Amino acid sequence: VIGVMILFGPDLGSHVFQYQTITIQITPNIGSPLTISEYVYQPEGSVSVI
Amino acid sequence: PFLAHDNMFTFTLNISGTLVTYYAFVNQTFAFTYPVAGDPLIGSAIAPAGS
Numbered sequence: 001v002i003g004v005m006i007l008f009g010p011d012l013g014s015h016v017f018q019y020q021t022i023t024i025q026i027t028p029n030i031g032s033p034l035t036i037s038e039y040v041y042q043p044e045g046s047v048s049v050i
Numbered sequence: 051p052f053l054a055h056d057n058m059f060t061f062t063l064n065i066s067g068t069l070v071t072y073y074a075f076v077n078q079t080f081a082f083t084y085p086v087a088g089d090p091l092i093g094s095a096i097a098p099a100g101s
Contacts, residue, residue, distance in 0.1 A: 044096055 018042060052077070 004026070023037040038050050056075040063070055085092070088101045 042094070044094060045091065 016043070 006024075017040050019039075019041060021037065021039050023035065025033055025035045027033040040048070040050060053075055056077045058073055058075050060071060060073050062072065083095070085101070089098060091098060
């Protein structure tokens with residue numbers, strides 16, 4: 001099991017995703033990629049679950 | 051002059067042993083919320099369970 005963490009810089013840190021469709025794609029060199037895709041409504045407790 | 055068209059309603063409070071009236075004016079129907087009991091998280095209008 002590997003862990004992945006994404007840190008936001010100033011360019012992208014000025015936006016808070018609300019009612020949008022965030023999507024990530026991890027593409028290795030050989031093999032199928034991994035496309036995460038979610039829809040985030042609102043945050044809570046400074047740490048959400050999706 | 052705009053207060054000649056709003057819907058005025060009053061309410062009185064007996065603060066510091068002297069009656070102090072008030073006058074609240076509204077120019078359009080609207081509704082709001084406010085916490086009454088058991089609301090730890092304040093800042094995002096998220097009503098906790100049992101609040």
